[PDB]
């Protein structure tokens, strides 16, 4: 029986929220139109209502909204300047109002922190995946069951942790965390790169994807090397050259959640622990102030 067991260490839901909101915005807001504060506030609140309802029915009552905040870049890019620069380039050339979207979304995130009953993990230069990785490690060790709500995020690196599930709202399905190939899949990114984030192979210079000249290519790497190092990372010093090994060390920081620097992880945990949760009364007053007359009818749903 459910009643006879809603756990003393309560279930925690971490929502990969910026990606859900942005995906929805790219569908709902057309190109060549100014994206304003009210548009974004409505979208964010509607998305929260849908996804919190989901967590709650699945039995995970503590909600943490994990936010991508790249207003001033990325801590990883302070390490590897080229990290994710391909993403910025693409947004520059778009006719969608990225500037208005981001400006409005930052304002709304601040309203959530002031008024809504969720822990909003938002720190400039920190990624939603950083909050999820660090908090899953923390909460899983403390004995909490965890639900990650993320449409397309790959959280298979978290395969070692007990009682972690992932639900994809976009695809309406459960997503494997214990995939059976998590270490190999992680190592493939470390060794061969992850082009979508401008991470290059260990067989080329660190900033290859950002500085590539015409005709340049990535030398291939044998799958067997990837599998060998995935199985025993000490093999990196045996199967890689010195130059490749130095690149492997760089790529570990860019890819592997276990290589989030101590200060970054400590900052995330400290921000969580000190978080000032708004009194539940502030929801109604926020909805009135923002003129959300339809949502005032749905307070209990938040």
UniProtKB/Swiss-Prot annotation:
Catalysed transformations (reactions): Endonucleolytic cleavage to 5'-phosphomonoester
One of the record's GO molecular function terms: DNA binding
Domain of life: Viruses
A Pfam family: RNaseH_C
First-level EC class: hydrolase
Swiss-Prot/TrEMBL keywords: DNA replication, Endonuclease, Exonuclease, Hydrolase, Nuclease
SMART domains, A to Z: 53EXOc, HhH2
E.C. numbers: 3.1.26.4
Example of a GO biological process term: DNA replication, removal of RNA primer
Role noted for this protein: Plays essential roles in DNA replication by removing the RNA primers from lagging strand fragments. Exhibits 5'to 3' exonuclease activity on either RNA/DNA or DNA/DNA duplexes and endonuclease activity on either flap or fork DNA structures.
Protein name listed in UniProt: Ribonuclease H
Gene designation per UniProt: rnh
